[PDB]
Amino acid sequence: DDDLSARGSEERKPPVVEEDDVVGFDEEADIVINRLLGESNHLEVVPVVGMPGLGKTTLANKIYKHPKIGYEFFTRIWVYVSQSYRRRELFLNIISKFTRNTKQYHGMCEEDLADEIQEFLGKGGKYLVVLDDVWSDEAWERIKIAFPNNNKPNRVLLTTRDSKVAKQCNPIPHDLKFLTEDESWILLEKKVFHKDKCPPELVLSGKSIAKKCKGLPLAIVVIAGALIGKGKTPREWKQVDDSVSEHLINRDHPENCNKLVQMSYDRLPYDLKACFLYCSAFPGGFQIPAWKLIRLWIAEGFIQYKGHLSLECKGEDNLNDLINRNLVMVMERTSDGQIKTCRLHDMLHEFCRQEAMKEENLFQEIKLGSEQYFPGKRELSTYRRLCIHSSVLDFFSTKPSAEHVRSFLSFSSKKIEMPSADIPTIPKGFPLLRVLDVESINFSRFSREFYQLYHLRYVAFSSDSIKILPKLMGELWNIQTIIINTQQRTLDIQANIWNMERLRHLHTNSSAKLPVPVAPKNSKVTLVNQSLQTLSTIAPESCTEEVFARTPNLKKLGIRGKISVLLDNKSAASLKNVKRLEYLENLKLINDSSIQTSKLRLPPAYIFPTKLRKLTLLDTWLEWKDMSILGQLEHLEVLKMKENGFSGESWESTGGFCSLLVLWIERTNLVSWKASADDFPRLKHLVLICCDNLKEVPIALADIRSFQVMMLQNSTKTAAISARQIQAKKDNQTQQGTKNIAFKLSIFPPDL
Template sequence: MRGSRVLFTTRDDKLGKFCCNKPHHLKFLTDDECWELLQKKVFHKDKCPLDLEELGERIAKKCMGLPLAALVIAGALTGRGKTKSEWEIVHQYVSEHIISSDIMMTKKLVQMSCDSLPVNLKACFLYCGAFPKGSEIPAWKIVRLWIAEGFIRETMQSTVETVAEGYLNELVSKSLLMVTQRTSNGQIKTFRVHDMLHEFCTLEASEENLFKEIKLGVEQSFPRNQVLATFRRLSIDSSVQEFISTNPYGDNIRSFLCFSSRNIVMSPYEFETIPKSFPLLRVLDIESILFELETIPKSPFQKQFFQLYHLRYIAISSDSLKILPKFMEDLWNLQTLIISTQQQTLNIEADICNMPQLRHLHTNASAKLCPSVLKTRNHHSALQTLSIIEPKTFTEEDVFARCQNLKSWVFVGI
């Protein structure tokens, strides 16, 4: 018919650009727009009572700009009445209402996008649910975790880092992840998963045995070792000390992730439990835990730790870590090493340039490499990232002679 128009909608940005050079991108609602939508759905043409306005605005803010979330919450508010106490209950459990109020509709909508993803990309998306709800996830961190987990495969044309960054951009283009910060050149710096999608990720990941969320309070007790045997990855919150005290064991566990929102202090002896309980770990992210080393001033790394030969990713924090021992070289599969310490310097005794898989070393202290490490130039290092390092112990030429793959490096004081 003359003058007719065809409206085509899709969650996939690439598909939209294939149909139209300049597709219209729907933006997330502002907090005010969310609140306006809520009011229309709950009160229709009436105005919101003054005593509910402030609470209603806070509820709208928790929808984080997602129209579907605002509609689901509006249904919950309508069904509960118009008293302040009832609205307080909804405000307290917004994310639960988003999922439970119409779980089939929510899951179906997200499932449509998720099922269309290739197997590896789907695993990358669901894996984001291992991070705490509402947290901003650094792009560099998720990229290196995906690589360590084995979700990314190197191609003839691209490195694993490039492929992983492409995966991240694709998930953003499909509206499955929300960018919160970008770098000066437009690259993704941090992102987050909407609460609705986060709930979907955790549920779907559990069903597919991708990872198990360990959270005391939601479950009255920790899963037994027989249950742990069905999972390969554990995501743990602030209950990590209580969980370790139960002496768990799982030789099938490949990843131990701890994302505590509160300050947890542990002793090196508690740390020893982890390699004993999970001897085949590939990923160990316990950066949110602070290890006190008063009894062992040198290092929390004991003999059993260096028998975790499969480790690819380590993130750890300590109050007085001063030395990265030579035994670190035994971890020949290690790709990413993140060390946070409250000390000003970190003496690296290990020949990190000779570790065949090590590509990224991060420390918040001034790292000093052993002079003997830099004199050996018969092996080219795989290191791509090196920060922060002490320039006084060597010249830049020494570093670049062995680390010819360096893409990012930071010298302290420069």
């Protein structure tokens, strides 16, 4: 008899980078910048202090990516220090950012670990460090031992939310400023309407809203998301106005922000409402892989197929919507421009964890204080999903048991070996499992009970010693996604992939030798699966036309092993088979052999599928003359070569890359590059890493409109000079009135 919100559903559009500028934060950035290099030849910290959600990390990032900072300091490191940081991993990451080899530093202790960072940071010159979210003095005191004072100016900028810690760091703390009402309205309007200005009738309500928030940017962001969610009518704006007035009666108290979030969370469609709380199953501050979160959504059953739109495409669309609402923060992006990593804001993570734990009983995490004890069987029976990120081996020593647990997730930081006597603890404890993400857990083997988990839907695991997948592994029919990581070079699959009815993905690091696909003699059914979309690394010998036949809709492919077999005339038909797969859009060719036993030549262009959009090559040692073949591809859009992908000293672009957007060349011995503006009409991003041997970059690239961003790392001085000429040329073109997209140039070593 009663119904509300009766309306149709419209389209939601892609999340292109926007509002890259920070509103009004530049003055604070400049005042902070002034205190940098205040006293040469000394190490000092610059505290930044304020309440959560105010914009401290936005300022820190704006400074860290400022031009003057990059020019002044050759070395710069960004490190995250959470509430629950760990020092050894932090030092490993710091050392890794500089070093190239991982083995040397692993056997060392944290003090000898700090000494290497000391020398590394000291040698170059001036260095600027950034510390995010430091909670206690002891954290800073323990961390700082790594930072050396090498008689030259070196600075560190740290952000914290408590006044006492900042007092201890420096006698005088820097205190951030709340936005003025005009700035509040400007930010709200820019976020809600993007380029377009606010309609006159909506202006009066928008001004009142901006004013209530009090100038805390996070509240303005959340309210803007809610406003775009609702739709634009004067009545709707009045309706949001009345509520925001109530919520913003007290502006400084914490819970108010939570209430605002609740508002934004209420309007969310019920499909996205579970996806949004699921993101908070991960640890606070964790960087979520986009593909792994979207796959964990389909297996949970949060995503429901509705017509033609694919489950994975739909899930990516959901993530784009969540980002657009400003609920999810986009940490990184791919070369394609698509999202790569994401995380939730601290306050939003708290809200989501509390809601999912208490109101909805979606999952529970087992976090133990020292006095506390691990729960017993009775309580665990009530749980539906588990999540253990802290000590889990101690949890499994208890020999837990729970029949009503369907999922288990463990996003540990380290990798933990499972004792041989505890391997059966997982299956026997949880025989009704649906998802099992234990990649941070290393399995020496699998007990027999792993093959009776008939309800398993997604599995990800890591095993150092695994070399053979038993036939029994193919018994389970429910699994839709599998991800495998193994240190062993060769993986032999004995489970029959083709009978498996559900799997929509397969992904491995090692090479995979598929069992030959044979139709049963007595069965009418044919083992063709429409659901499969990838085989990340199949062995070259397994690229037989039958195997390609079994996979109709693979939207991606990848081969690891010897590329010569497919390139060789005897087995050239093997590579020619790739023409069969129509859907292909992403092809990766990795080579592991370290001996250049012969030269390699690409077969003609028509062999490659028509849609191929992204291509990556590693250690193939191909001649730069073959680039014409890859140019003949009409759709190919991102091209990456790494670890000497193309070998040769002279390359002359011959055109063909009509629809290309990104070039990525890494660790090649090219010396002379020749090209014209018509070679790459549509290039946007250009990456050149460790090209220690190339004399010059074609100035013709300066004449191309799509060319937006350029990056050079560990390159020759002449290359940097040519890049600086290109920058000047594009600045002149933009100054000449042409509607040319803005040009940015970064040289990783600024002195090049």
